[PDB]
Design a protein around this ligand. Structure first.
Ligand SMILES: CN[C@@H]1[C@@H](O)[C@@H](O[C@@H]2[C@@H](O)[C@H](O[C@H]3OC(CN)=CC[C@H]3N)[C@@H](NC(C)=O)C[C@H]2N)OC[C@]1(C)O
Ligand SMILES: [Mg+2]
Length: 268
């Protein structure tokens, strides 16, 4: 029979989620299996698990981000520029390919949303406003991003049946890693500034592979290779959440591991 909220809360407590914790979930709902009231039951359990003084941060992005449509141009192509919707943080659906749970997180009453349309983060809790801003274009996952502040706030990464490729915080490791040959990308996003639609073009680190050898689509990335090597070497709390094998990862520790991992393999 489908998992109940209190059952999930018990599993999260066993895993090491505490009242006051700041948690970043990565969830495969197919692994979890049927839920009493659908995905909201797990959203509710995470909110109950972290308590009223805890916080949830999620990488939700945007269903309609014009990423591929502007990549590699110094300006949005005319047909894109002339009609694309402005990013409206309180009305933009999450990108479905990063987990169906993100649309439930981001529509939760009181949730905050970062202003980076492609890297958009969602946060719930007393620290949500501090988490989500600033989030400038050009600072998607590195210093000054919500990922950076999460790492400075004892964040835990909660992987719920998700693979080692689904660790967005490791992009911070890619951003600051002192290695040669790091790829950069240029794209354009449409923000709303004082009700006016404004196209902004910026450059950031390539989040589809920080080095040439990691950016092949067929095709494991650096995140997957770092996270798997880390889990092979580190004691990490493991156990079920629903039907999904889950991990509770110290975010500061795995990112610090990732910096050492990349810099040891590539010259400074
Ligand atoms: C919303 N628009 C998107 C645009 O933001 C960008 O998304 C990337 C995203 O691909 C990438 O996840 C890939 O990581 C890898 C291999 N590299 C395995 C899984 C891949 N999905 C994210 N990193 C994670 C999840 O750690 C960063 C994100 N910035 O490119 C595609 C896009 C759909 O257009
Ligand atoms: Mg607090």
């Amino acid at each position: 029979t489908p998992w109940s909220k209190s059952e999930l809360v018990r599993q999260l407590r066993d895993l090491g989620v505490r009242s006051g914790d700041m948690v970043m979930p990565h969830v495969s709902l197919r692994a979890v299996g049927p839920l009493a009231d659908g995905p909201q039951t797990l959203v509710d359990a995470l909110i109950e698990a972290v308590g009223p003084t805890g916080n949830i941060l999620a990488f939700v992005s945007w269903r309609d981000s014009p990423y591929e449509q502007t990549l590699g141009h110094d300006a949005p192509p005319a047909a894109i520029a002339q009609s694309w919707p402005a990013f409206d943080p309180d009305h933009a659906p999450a990108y479905p390919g990063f987990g169906a749970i993100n649309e439930f997180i981001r529509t939760y009453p009181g949730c905050r949303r970062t202003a980076h349309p492609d890297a958009s983060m969602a946060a719930i809790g007393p620290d949500a406003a501090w988490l989500v801003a600033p989030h400038e274009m050009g600072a998607a996952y590195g210093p000054r991003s919500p990922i950076a502040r999460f790492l400075a706030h004892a964040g835990k990464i909660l992987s719920i049946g998700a693979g080692p490729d689904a660790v967005t915080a490791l992009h911070y490791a890619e951003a600051v890693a002192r290695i040669e040959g790091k790829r950069r990308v240029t794209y354009s996003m449409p923000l709303l500034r004082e009700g006016k639609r404004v196209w902004v073009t910026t450059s950031d680190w390539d989040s589809n592979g920080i080095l040439d050898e990691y950016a092949a689509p067929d095709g494991p990335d650096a995140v997957e290779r770092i996270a798997r090597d880390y889990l092979a070497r580190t004691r990490v709390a493991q156990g079920p959440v629903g039907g999904a094998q889950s991990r509770l990862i110290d975010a500061a520790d795995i990112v610090s591991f990732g910096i050492e991992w990349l810099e040891a393999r590539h010259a400074a």
